[PDB]
Amino acid sequence: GHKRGEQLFTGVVPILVELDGDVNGHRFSVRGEGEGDATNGRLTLRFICTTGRLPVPWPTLVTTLVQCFSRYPDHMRRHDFFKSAMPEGYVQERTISFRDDGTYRTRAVVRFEGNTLVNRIELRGTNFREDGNILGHRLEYNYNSHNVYITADRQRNGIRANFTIRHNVEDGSVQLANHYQQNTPIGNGPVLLPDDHYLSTQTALSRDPNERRDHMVLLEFVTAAGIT
Ligand SMILES: [Cu+2]
């Protein structure tokens, strides 16, 4: 499926993100729109909290809110699981453990709906501290560069990823978010299962001065590396 998969991403692809979330019994929804340019490994997205203020810091949802837009160099094309699963797409599941705080469990469907790449997510957050960094909104509105370590999950016919996000805290400390990720294709067609490699992920967060709703503007650059 990789030949057709690659062809789906050679241009600029519209993106829709829909997240329904419940954190410590606080229900919220996020809607995101923008576009992806996999050739350049570039995402540009605008996210709105449609339900009110986000009950958690925007930066904590970045990983949850489309690794099919990663730039896989030609010499790594046989290691691109994400595109090879398209258009039928994949299920992306995570446990995100915040050190000394609560846990997110996420399930997402990532697939084409017509010419749009859609990320539809359910998130459940449990055991957050009422006056921790997360529910207290003491995380800086910024984002560090990270490596996403990818390994094949042959039994699942998919991939696993492990990485730790470092969230800057307003007091100059760091909040760690331990990410456990698994991806499973939805379709029956063949997918590429990769050799061990990583996604070099860079994220810039900004605000829209014209927007009254709680929101996040995101630019992301993602390149596959670690195979010579
Ligand atoms: Cu293929």
mmCIF file with all atom_site columns, N, CA and C in Angstrom, residues 44-110:
data_model
loop_
_atom_site.group_PDB
_atom_site.id
_atom_site.type_symbol
_atom_site.label_atom_id
_atom_site.label_alt_id
_atom_site.label_comp_id
_atom_site.label_asym_id
_atom_site.label_entity_id
_atom_site.label_seq_id
_atom_site.pdbx_PDB_ins_code
_atom_site.Cartn_x
_atom_site.Cartn_y
_atom_site.Cartn_z
_atom_site.occupancy
_atom_site.B_iso_or_equiv
_atom_site.pdbx_formal_charge
_atom_site.auth_seq_id
_atom_site.auth_comp_id
_atom_site.auth_asym_id
_atom_site.auth_atom_id
_atom_site.pdbx_PDB_model_num
ATOM 1   N N  . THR A 1 44  ? 0.767   22.796 9.558  1.00 0.00 ? 44  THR A N  1
ATOM 2   C CA . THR A 1 44  ? 0.271   24.089 10.062 1.00 0.00 ? 44  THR A CA 1
ATOM 3   C C  . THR A 1 44  ? -1.194  23.899 10.457 1.00 0.00 ? 44  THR A C  1
ATOM 4   N N  . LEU A 1 45  ? -1.483  24.125 11.742 1.00 0.00 ? 45  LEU A N  1
ATOM 5   C CA . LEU A 1 45  ? -2.826  23.809 12.285 1.00 0.00 ? 45  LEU A CA 1
ATOM 6   C C  . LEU A 1 45  ? -3.254  24.907 13.262 1.00 0.00 ? 45  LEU A C  1
ATOM 7   N N  . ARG A 1 46  ? -4.561  25.160 13.272 1.00 0.00 ? 46  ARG A N  1
ATOM 8   C CA . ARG A 1 46  ? -5.213  26.074 14.239 1.00 0.00 ? 46  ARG A CA 1
ATOM 9   C C  . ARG A 1 46  ? -6.227  25.231 15.009 1.00 0.00 ? 46  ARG A C  1
ATOM 10  N N  . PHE A 1 47  ? -6.120  25.267 16.333 1.00 0.00 ? 47  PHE A N  1
ATOM 11  C CA . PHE A 1 47  ? -6.994  24.496 17.251 1.00 0.00 ? 47  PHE A CA 1
ATOM 12  C C  . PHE A 1 47  ? -7.839  25.457 18.086 1.00 0.00 ? 47  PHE A C  1
ATOM 13  N N  . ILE A 1 48  ? -9.111  25.097 18.248 1.00 0.00 ? 48  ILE A N  1
ATOM 14  C CA . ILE A 1 48  ? -10.105 25.817 19.084 1.00 0.00 ? 48  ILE A CA 1
ATOM 15  C C  . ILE A 1 48  ? -10.609 24.856 20.157 1.00 0.00 ? 48  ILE A C  1
ATOM 16  N N  . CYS A 1 49  ? -10.667 25.333 21.411 1.00 0.00 ? 49  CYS A N  1
ATOM 17  C CA . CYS A 1 49  ? -11.468 24.628 22.442 1.00 0.00 ? 49  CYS A CA 1
ATOM 18  C C  . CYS A 1 49  ? -12.913 25.104 22.296 1.00 0.00 ? 49  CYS A C  1
ATOM 19  N N  . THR A 1 50  ? -13.798 24.230 21.805 1.00 0.00 ? 50  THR A N  1
ATOM 20  C CA . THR A 1 50  ? -15.178 24.627 21.409 1.00 0.00 ? 50  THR A CA 1
ATOM 21  C C  . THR A 1 50  ? -16.101 24.661 22.637 1.00 0.00 ? 50  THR A C  1
ATOM 22  N N  . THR A 1 51  ? -15.649 24.154 23.776 1.00 0.00 ? 51  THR A N  1
ATOM 23  C CA . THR A 1 51  ? -16.501 23.917 24.969 1.00 0.00 ? 51  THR A CA 1
ATOM 24  C C  . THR A 1 51  ? -16.267 24.985 26.037 1.00 0.00 ? 51  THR A C  1
ATOM 25  N N  . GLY A 1 52  ? -15.291 25.874 25.850 1.00 0.00 ? 52  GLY A N  1
ATOM 26  C CA . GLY A 1 52  ? -14.862 26.842 26.878 1.00 0.00 ? 52  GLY A CA 1
ATOM 27  C C  . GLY A 1 52  ? -13.347 26.904 26.947 1.00 0.00 ? 52  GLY A C  1
ATOM 28  N N  . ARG A 1 53  ? -12.795 27.164 28.130 1.00 0.00 ? 53  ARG A N  1
ATOM 29  C CA . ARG A 1 53  ? -11.334 27.119 28.352 1.00 0.00 ? 53  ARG A CA 1
ATOM 30  C C  . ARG A 1 53  ? -10.934 25.645 28.395 1.00 0.00 ? 53  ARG A C  1
ATOM 31  N N  . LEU A 1 54  ? -9.766  25.335 27.853 1.00 0.00 ? 54  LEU A N  1
ATOM 32  C CA . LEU A 1 54  ? -9.176  23.987 27.985 1.00 0.00 ? 54  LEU A CA 1
ATOM 33  C C  . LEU A 1 54  ? -8.920  23.727 29.472 1.00 0.00 ? 54  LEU A C  1
ATOM 34  N N  . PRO A 1 55  ? -9.401  22.588 30.018 1.00 0.00 ? 55  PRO A N  1
ATOM 35  C CA . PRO A 1 55  ? -9.180  22.267 31.428 1.00 0.00 ? 55  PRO A CA 1
ATOM 36  C C  . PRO A 1 55  ? -7.747  21.810 31.737 1.00 0.00 ? 55  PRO A C  1
ATOM 37  N N  . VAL A 1 56  ? -6.926  21.633 30.705 1.00 0.00 ? 56  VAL A N  1
ATOM 38  C CA . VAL A 1 56  ? -5.480  21.293 30.807 1.00 0.00 ? 56  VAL A CA 1
ATOM 39  C C  . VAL A 1 56  ? -4.706  22.262 29.918 1.00 0.00 ? 56  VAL A C  1
ATOM 40  N N  . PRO A 1 57  ? -3.370  22.386 30.104 1.00 0.00 ? 57  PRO A N  1
ATOM 41  C CA . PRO A 1 57  ? -2.563  23.256 29.253 1.00 0.00 ? 57  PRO A CA 1
ATOM 42  C C  . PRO A 1 57  ? -2.474  22.748 27.806 1.00 0.00 ? 57  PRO A C  1
ATOM 43  N N  . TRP A 1 58  ? -2.605  23.673 26.848 1.00 0.00 ? 58  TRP A N  1
ATOM 44  C CA . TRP A 1 58  ? -2.499  23.359 25.394 1.00 0.00 ? 58  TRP A CA 1
ATOM 45  C C  . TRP A 1 58  ? -1.309  22.440 25.125 1.00 0.00 ? 58  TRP A C  1
ATOM 46  N N  . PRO A 1 59  ? -0.096  22.785 25.621 1.00 0.00 ? 59  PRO A N  1
ATOM 47  C CA . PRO A 1 59  ? 1.077   21.962 25.336 1.00 0.00 ? 59  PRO A CA 1
ATOM 48  C C  . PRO A 1 59  ? 0.851   20.484 25.685 1.00 0.00 ? 59  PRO A C  1
ATOM 49  N N  . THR A 1 60  ? -0.001  20.157 26.668 1.00 0.00 ? 60  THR A N  1
ATOM 50  C CA . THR A 1 60  ? -0.169  18.738 27.083 1.00 0.00 ? 60  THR A CA 1
ATOM 51  C C  . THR A 1 60  ? -0.943  17.963 26.010 1.00 0.00 ? 60  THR A C  1
ATOM 52  N N  . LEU A 1 61  ? -1.596  18.648 25.057 1.00 0.00 ? 61  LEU A N  1
ATOM 53  C CA . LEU A 1 61  ? -2.432  17.951 24.037 1.00 0.00 ? 61  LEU A CA 1
ATOM 54  C C  . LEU A 1 61  ? -1.701  17.856 22.692 1.00 0.00 ? 61  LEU A C  1
ATOM 55  N N  . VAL A 1 62  ? -0.540  18.495 22.566 1.00 0.00 ? 62  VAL A N  1
ATOM 56  C CA . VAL A 1 62  ? 0.180   18.593 21.265 1.00 0.00 ? 62  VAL A CA 1
ATOM 57  C C  . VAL A 1 62  ? 0.375   17.181 20.695 1.00 0.00 ? 62  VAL A C  1
ATOM 58  N N  . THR A 1 63  ? 0.885   16.233 21.477 1.00 0.00 ? 63  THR A N  1
ATOM 59  C CA . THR A 1 63  ? 1.212   14.902 20.904 1.00 0.00 ? 63  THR A CA 1
ATOM 60  C C  . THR A 1 63  ? -0.086  14.216 20.470 1.00 0.00 ? 63  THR A C  1
ATOM 61  N N  . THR A 1 64  ? -1.171  14.432 21.206 1.00 0.00 ? 64  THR A N  1
ATOM 62  C CA . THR A 1 64  ? -2.475  13.786 20.937 1.00 0.00 ? 64  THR A CA 1
ATOM 63  C C  . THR A 1 64  ? -3.039  14.390 19.643 1.00 0.00 ? 64  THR A C  1
ATOM 64  N N  . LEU A 1 65  ? -2.977  15.717 19.512 1.00 0.00 ? 65  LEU A N  1
ATOM 65  C CA . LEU A 1 65  ? -3.557  16.409 18.339 1.00 0.00 ? 65  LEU A CA 1
ATOM 66  C C  . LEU A 1 65  ? -2.677  16.190 17.105 1.00 0.00 ? 65  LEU A C  1
ATOM 67  N N  . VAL A 1 66  ? -0.548  13.165 13.763 1.00 0.00 ? 66  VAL A N  1
ATOM 68  C CA . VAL A 1 66  ? -0.718  12.864 12.306 1.00 0.00 ? 66  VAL A CA 1
ATOM 69  C C  . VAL A 1 66  ? 0.671   12.642 11.693 1.00 0.00 ? 66  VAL A C  1
ATOM 70  N N  . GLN A 1 67  ? 1.347   11.603 12.188 1.00 0.00 ? 67  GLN A N  1
ATOM 71  C CA . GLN A 1 67  ? 2.774   11.337 11.877 1.00 0.00 ? 67  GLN A CA 1
ATOM 72  C C  . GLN A 1 67  ? 2.914   10.865 10.423 1.00 0.00 ? 67  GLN A C  1
ATOM 73  N N  . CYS A 1 68  ? 1.803   10.655 9.708  1.00 0.00 ? 68  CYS A N  1
ATOM 74  C CA . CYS A 1 68  ? 1.815   10.458 8.231  1.00 0.00 ? 68  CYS A CA 1
ATOM 75  C C  . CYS A 1 68  ? 2.406   11.685 7.516  1.00 0.00 ? 68  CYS A C  1
ATOM 76  N N  . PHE A 1 69  ? 2.476   12.848 8.164  1.00 0.00 ? 69  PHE A N  1
ATOM 77  C CA . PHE A 1 69  ? 3.056   14.074 7.550  1.00 0.00 ? 69  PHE A CA 1
ATOM 78  C C  . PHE A 1 69  ? 4.562   14.203 7.812  1.00 0.00 ? 69  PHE A C  1
ATOM 79  N N  . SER A 1 70  ? 5.202   13.189 8.398  1.00 0.00 ? 70  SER A N  1
ATOM 80  C CA . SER A 1 70  ? 6.671   13.181 8.612  1.00 0.00 ? 70  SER A CA 1
ATOM 81  C C  . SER A 1 70  ? 7.389   13.172 7.256  1.00 0.00 ? 70  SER A C  1
ATOM 82  N N  . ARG A 1 71  ? 8.526   13.862 7.150  1.00 0.00 ? 71  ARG A N  1
ATOM 83  C CA . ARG A 1 71  ? 9.434   13.771 5.984  1.00 0.00 ? 71  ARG A CA 1
ATOM 84  C C  . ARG A 1 71  ? 10.307  12.524 6.153  1.00 0.00 ? 71  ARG A C  1
ATOM 85  N N  . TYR A 1 72  ? 9.985   11.445 5.446  1.00 0.00 ? 72  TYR A N  1
ATOM 86  C CA . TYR A 1 72  ? 10.856  10.246 5.339  1.00 0.00 ? 72  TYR A CA 1
ATOM 87  C C  . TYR A 1 72  ? 11.789  10.472 4.153  1.00 0.00 ? 72  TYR A C  1
ATOM 88  N N  . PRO A 1 73  ? 13.117  10.577 4.388  1.00 0.00 ? 73  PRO A N  1
ATOM 89  C CA . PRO A 1 73  ? 14.085  10.703 3.301  1.00 0.00 ? 73  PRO A CA 1
ATOM 90  C C  . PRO A 1 73  ? 13.954  9.509  2.343  1.00 0.00 ? 73  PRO A C  1
ATOM 91  N N  . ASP A 1 74  ? 14.336  9.682  1.079  1.00 0.00 ? 74  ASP A N  1
ATOM 92  C CA . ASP A 1 74  ? 14.194  8.619  0.050  1.00 0.00 ? 74  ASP A CA 1
ATOM 93  C C  . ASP A 1 74  ? 14.791  7.312  0.586  1.00 0.00 ? 74  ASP A C  1
ATOM 94  N N  . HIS A 1 75  ? 15.983  7.378  1.186  1.00 0.00 ? 75  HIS A N  1
ATOM 95  C CA . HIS A 1 75  ? 16.725  6.190  1.691  1.00 0.00 ? 75  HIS A CA 1
ATOM 96  C C  . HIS A 1 75  ? 15.998  5.540  2.880  1.00 0.00 ? 75  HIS A C  1
ATOM 97  N N  . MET A 1 76  ? 14.915  6.137  3.405  1.00 0.00 ? 76  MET A N  1
ATOM 98  C CA . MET A 1 76  ? 14.105  5.518  4.491  1.00 0.00 ? 76  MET A CA 1
ATOM 99  C C  . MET A 1 76  ? 12.665  5.239  4.039  1.00 0.00 ? 76  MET A C  1
ATOM 100 N N  . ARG A 1 77  ? 12.380  5.291  2.734  1.00 0.00 ? 77  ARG A N  1
ATOM 101 C CA . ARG A 1 77  ? 10.977  5.186  2.242  1.00 0.00 ? 77  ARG A CA 1
ATOM 102 C C  . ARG A 1 77  ? 10.345  3.841  2.641  1.00 0.00 ? 77  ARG A C  1
ATOM 103 N N  . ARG A 1 78  ? 11.126  2.784  2.805  1.00 0.00 ? 78  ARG A N  1
ATOM 104 C CA . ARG A 1 78  ? 10.577  1.442  3.143  1.00 0.00 ? 78  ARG A CA 1
ATOM 105 C C  . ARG A 1 78  ? 10.240  1.381  4.639  1.00 0.00 ? 78  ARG A C  1
ATOM 106 N N  . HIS A 1 79  ? 10.491  2.453  5.395  1.00 0.00 ? 79  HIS A N  1
ATOM 107 C CA . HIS A 1 79  ? 10.274  2.441  6.869  1.00 0.00 ? 79  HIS A CA 1
ATOM 108 C C  . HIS A 1 79  ? 9.117   3.357  7.276  1.00 0.00 ? 79  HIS A C  1
ATOM 109 N N  . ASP A 1 80  ? 8.321   3.822  6.313  1.00 0.00 ? 80  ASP A N  1
ATOM 110 C CA . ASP A 1 80  ? 7.209   4.785  6.554  1.00 0.00 ? 80  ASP A CA 1
ATOM 111 C C  . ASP A 1 80  ? 5.889   4.017  6.716  1.00 0.00 ? 80  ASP A C  1
ATOM 112 N N  . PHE A 1 81  ? 5.632   3.495  7.917  1.00 0.00 ? 81  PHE A N  1
ATOM 113 C CA . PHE A 1 81  ? 4.379   2.776  8.257  1.00 0.00 ? 81  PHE A CA 1
ATOM 114 C C  . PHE A 1 81  ? 3.174   3.690  7.989  1.00 0.00 ? 81  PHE A C  1
ATOM 115 N N  . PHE A 1 82  ? 3.277   4.938  8.451  1.00 0.00 ? 82  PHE A N  1
ATOM 116 C CA . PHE A 1 82  ? 2.134   5.872  8.556  1.00 0.00 ? 82  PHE A CA 1
ATOM 117 C C  . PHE A 1 82  ? 1.474   6.072  7.185  1.00 0.00 ? 82  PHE A C  1
ATOM 118 N N  . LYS A 1 83  ? 2.250   6.405  6.154  1.00 0.00 ? 83  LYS A N  1
ATOM 119 C CA . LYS A 1 83  ? 1.700   6.645  4.786  1.00 0.00 ? 83  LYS A CA 1
ATOM 120 C C  . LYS A 1 83  ? 1.202   5.324  4.206  1.00 0.00 ? 83  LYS A C  1
ATOM 121 N N  . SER A 1 84  ? 1.893   4.217  4.500  1.00 0.00 ? 84  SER A N  1
ATOM 122 C CA . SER A 1 84  ? 1.599   2.908  3.849  1.00 0.00 ? 84  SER A CA 1
ATOM 123 C C  . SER A 1 84  ? 0.216   2.408  4.286  1.00 0.00 ? 84  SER A C  1
ATOM 124 N N  . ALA A 1 85  ? -0.290  2.899  5.436  1.00 0.00 ? 85  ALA A N  1
ATOM 125 C CA . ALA A 1 85  ? -1.610  2.505  5.987  1.00 0.00 ? 85  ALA A CA 1
ATOM 126 C C  . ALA A 1 85  ? -2.733  3.312  5.324  1.00 0.00 ? 85  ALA A C  1
ATOM 127 N N  . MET A 1 86  ? -2.400  4.372  4.596  1.00 0.00 ? 86  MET A N  1
ATOM 128 C CA . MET A 1 86  ? -3.423  5.258  3.995  1.00 0.00 ? 86  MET A CA 1
ATOM 129 C C  . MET A 1 86  ? -3.874  4.653  2.670  1.00 0.00 ? 86  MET A C  1
ATOM 130 N N  . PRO A 1 87  ? -5.119  4.927  2.220  1.00 0.00 ? 87  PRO A N  1
ATOM 131 C CA . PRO A 1 87  ? -6.040  5.863  2.886  1.00 0.00 ? 87  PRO A CA 1
ATOM 132 C C  . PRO A 1 87  ? -6.931  5.317  4.014  1.00 0.00 ? 87  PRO A C  1
ATOM 133 N N  . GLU A 1 88  ? -6.979  3.995  4.197  1.00 0.00 ? 88  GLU A N  1
ATOM 134 C CA . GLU A 1 88  ? -7.890  3.352  5.182  1.00 0.00 ? 88  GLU A CA 1
ATOM 135 C C  . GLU A 1 88  ? -7.455  3.782  6.594  1.00 0.00 ? 88  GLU A C  1
ATOM 136 N N  . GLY A 1 89  ? -6.155  4.024  6.767  1.00 0.00 ? 89  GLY A N  1
ATOM 137 C CA . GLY A 1 89  ? -5.577  4.702  7.931  1.00 0.00 ? 89  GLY A CA 1
ATOM 138 C C  . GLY A 1 89  ? -5.203  3.752  9.052  1.00 0.00 ? 89  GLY A C  1
ATOM 139 N N  . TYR A 1 90  ? -5.020  4.327  10.234 1.00 0.00 ? 90  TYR A N  1
ATOM 140 C CA . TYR A 1 90  ? -4.580  3.537  11.399 1.00 0.00 ? 90  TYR A CA 1
ATOM 141 C C  . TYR A 1 90  ? -5.253  4.057  12.661 1.00 0.00 ? 90  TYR A C  1
ATOM 142 N N  . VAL A 1 91  ? -5.288  3.161  13.646 1.00 0.00 ? 91  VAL A N  1
ATOM 143 C CA . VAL A 1 91  ? -5.665  3.490  15.046 1.00 0.00 ? 91  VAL A CA 1
ATOM 144 C C  . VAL A 1 91  ? -4.369  3.804  15.789 1.00 0.00 ? 91  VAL A C  1
ATOM 145 N N  . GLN A 1 92  ? -4.346  4.964  16.445 1.00 0.00 ? 92  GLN A N  1
ATOM 146 C CA . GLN A 1 92  ? -3.181  5.418  17.242 1.00 0.00 ? 92  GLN A CA 1
ATOM 147 C C  . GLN A 1 92  ? -3.643  5.494  18.692 1.00 0.00 ? 92  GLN A C  1
ATOM 148 N N  . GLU A 1 93  ? -3.003  4.712  19.564 1.00 0.00 ? 93  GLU A N  1
ATOM 149 C CA . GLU A 1 93  ? -3.402  4.624  20.984 1.00 0.00 ? 93  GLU A CA 1
ATOM 150 C C  . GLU A 1 93  ? -2.202  5.032  21.825 1.00 0.00 ? 93  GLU A C  1
ATOM 151 N N  . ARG A 1 94  ? -2.454  5.792  22.894 1.00 0.00 ? 94  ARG A N  1
ATOM 152 C CA . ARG A 1 94  ? -1.361  6.186  23.800 1.00 0.00 ? 94  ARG A CA 1
ATOM 153 C C  . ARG A 1 94  ? -1.831  6.109  25.243 1.00 0.00 ? 94  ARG A C  1
ATOM 154 N N  . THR A 1 95  ? -0.851  5.814  26.098 1.00 0.00 ? 95  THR A N  1
ATOM 155 C CA . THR A 1 95  ? -0.857  6.140  27.537 1.00 0.00 ? 95  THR A CA 1
ATOM 156 C C  . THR A 1 95  ? 0.215   7.209  27.726 1.00 0.00 ? 95  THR A C  1
ATOM 157 N N  . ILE A 1 96  ? -0.185  8.316  28.343 1.00 0.00 ? 96  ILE A N  1
ATOM 158 C CA . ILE A 1 96  ? 0.709   9.467  28.627 1.00 0.00 ? 96  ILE A CA 1
ATOM 159 C C  . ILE A 1 96  ? 0.687   9.658  30.138 1.00 0.00 ? 96  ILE A C  1
ATOM 160 N N  . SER A 1 97  ? 1.789   9.284  30.765 1.00 0.00 ? 97  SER A N  1
ATOM 161 C CA . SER A 1 97  ? 1.942   9.341  32.238 1.00 0.00 ? 97  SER A CA 1
ATOM 162 C C  . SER A 1 97  ? 2.705   10.616 32.600 1.00 0.00 ? 97  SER A C  1
ATOM 163 N N  . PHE A 1 98  ? 2.027   11.571 33.245 1.00 0.00 ? 98  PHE A N  1
ATOM 164 C CA . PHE A 1 98  ? 2.673   12.804 33.749 1.00 0.00 ? 98  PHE A CA 1
ATOM 165 C C  . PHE A 1 98  ? 3.319   12.476 35.093 1.00 0.00 ? 98  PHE A C  1
ATOM 166 N N  . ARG A 1 99  ? 4.643   12.639 35.173 1.00 0.00 ? 99  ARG A N  1
ATOM 167 C CA . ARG A 1 99  ? 5.422   12.336 36.403 1.00 0.00 ? 99  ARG A CA 1
ATOM 168 C C  . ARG A 1 99  ? 4.801   13.104 37.576 1.00 0.00 ? 99  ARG A C  1
ATOM 169 N N  . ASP A 1 100 ? 4.506   12.395 38.666 1.00 0.00 ? 100 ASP A N  1
ATOM 170 C CA . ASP A 1 100 ? 3.933   12.968 39.910 1.00 0.00 ? 100 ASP A CA 1
ATOM 171 C C  . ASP A 1 100 ? 2.560   13.569 39.604 1.00 0.00 ? 100 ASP A C  1
ATOM 172 N N  . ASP A 1 101 ? 1.874   13.111 38.545 1.00 0.00 ? 101 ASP A N  1
ATOM 173 C CA . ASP A 1 101 ? 0.513   13.639 38.264 1.00 0.00 ? 101 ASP A CA 1
ATOM 174 C C  . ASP A 1 101 ? -0.296  12.571 37.521 1.00 0.00 ? 101 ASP A C  1
ATOM 175 N N  . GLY A 1 102 ? -1.339  12.985 36.810 1.00 0.00 ? 102 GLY A N  1
ATOM 176 C CA . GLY A 1 102 ? -2.342  12.078 36.234 1.00 0.00 ? 102 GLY A CA 1
ATOM 177 C C  . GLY A 1 102 ? -1.862  11.408 34.959 1.00 0.00 ? 102 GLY A C  1
ATOM 178 N N  . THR A 1 103 ? -2.780  10.692 34.312 1.00 0.00 ? 103 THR A N  1
ATOM 179 C CA . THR A 1 103 ? -2.507  9.918  33.074 1.00 0.00 ? 103 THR A CA 1
ATOM 180 C C  . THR A 1 103 ? -3.571  10.240 32.022 1.00 0.00 ? 103 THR A C  1
ATOM 181 N N  . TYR A 1 104 ? -3.140  10.462 30.779 1.00 0.00 ? 104 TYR A N  1
ATOM 182 C CA . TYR A 1 104 ? -4.047  10.475 29.602 1.00 0.00 ? 104 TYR A CA 1
ATOM 183 C C  . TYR A 1 104 ? -4.026  9.088  28.961 1.00 0.00 ? 104 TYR A C  1
ATOM 184 N N  . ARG A 1 105 ? -5.201  8.589  28.595 1.00 0.00 ? 105 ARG A N  1
ATOM 185 C CA . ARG A 1 105 ? -5.336  7.438  27.679 1.00 0.00 ? 105 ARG A CA 1
ATOM 186 C C  . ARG A 1 105 ? -6.067  7.940  26.444 1.00 0.00 ? 105 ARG A C  1
ATOM 187 N N  . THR A 1 106 ? -5.456  7.723  25.274 1.00 0.00 ? 106 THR A N  1
ATOM 188 C CA . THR A 1 106 ? -6.013  8.265  24.006 1.00 0.00 ? 106 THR A CA 1
ATOM 189 C C  . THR A 1 106 ? -6.207  7.141  22.997 1.00 0.00 ? 106 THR A C  1
ATOM 190 N N  . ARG A 1 107 ? -7.284  7.259  22.218 1.00 0.00 ? 107 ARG A N  1
ATOM 191 C CA . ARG A 1 107 ? -7.546  6.415  21.033 1.00 0.00 ? 107 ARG A CA 1
ATOM 192 C C  . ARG A 1 107 ? -7.958  7.338  19.892 1.00 0.00 ? 107 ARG A C  1
ATOM 193 N N  . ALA A 1 108 ? -7.229  7.244  18.783 1.00 0.00 ? 108 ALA A N  1
ATOM 194 C CA . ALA A 1 108 ? -7.460  8.086  17.595 1.00 0.00 ? 108 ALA A CA 1
ATOM 195 C C  . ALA A 1 108 ? -7.602  7.190  16.375 1.00 0.00 ? 108 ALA A C  1
ATOM 196 N N  . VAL A 1 109 ? -8.513  7.593  15.497 1.00 0.00 ? 109 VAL A N  1
ATOM 197 C CA . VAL A 1 109 ? -8.589  7.095  14.099 1.00 0.00 ? 109 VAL A CA 1
ATOM 198 C C  . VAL A 1 109 ? -7.964  8.175  13.221 1.00 0.00 ? 109 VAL A C  1
ATOM 199 N N  . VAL A 1 110 ? -6.915  7.781  12.482 1.00 0.00 ? 110 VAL A N  1
ATOM 200 C CA . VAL A 1 110 ? -6.252  8.676  11.493 1.00 0.00 ? 110 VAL A CA 1
ATOM 201 C C  . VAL A 1 110 ? -6.485  8.067  10.108 1.00 0.00 ? 110 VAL A C  1
#
